[PDB]
Amino acid sequence: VKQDMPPVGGYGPIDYKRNLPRRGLSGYSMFAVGIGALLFGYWSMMRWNRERRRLQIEDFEARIALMP
Amino acid sequence: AMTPFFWMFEEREKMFEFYERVSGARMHAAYVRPGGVHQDLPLGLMDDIYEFS
Known part of the structure; x- marks a missing residue:
């Protein structure tokens, strides 16, 4: 047998997206x-004043x- | 912008670990003869590359 370093039947994919949630409030709601x-x-x-x-x-x- | 320097240098330390395991040098891995790659990669490397990816 031979004992190289192959990949075992194919590996999983790895993402390439600029993954951004952009969460938080809007302008109107945070403003208000x-x-x-x-x-x-x-x-x-x-x-109080x-x-x-x-x-x-x-x-x-x-x-x-008090004065005089 | 002091800190992402350090963050991505931690990542670059991981890749220096990969270069070390492959050739043995820290940074000046010659490793590429004219006419192919000298002293091919050891067993137990590709899945580490996968996790790093």
Whole structure:
């Protein structure tokens, strides 16, 4: 017998495609969810700032009543 | 672009392993006489090429 290195009856194929998934969101959906979380942060920001101004006015009234 | 240098050099180290097993040199594998290939490839190589592919 002979003992070279042949391929055994043929081998499987190997791909040659530029395999790209291009996944992720679109323009509109990513854009809208970013602006939506932005507006959520704005609303909570507005609420905290106006309640904070209430308390800071109370601090002003403390210094007024303390002064003379 | 520091890193894909290293990545594809890992791939090139695998192919240097194939050159080493075939000839014995790291890089300067002469191995090709005028008039054919000297000292043909050992047994257990083609499936390794397949997995690398």
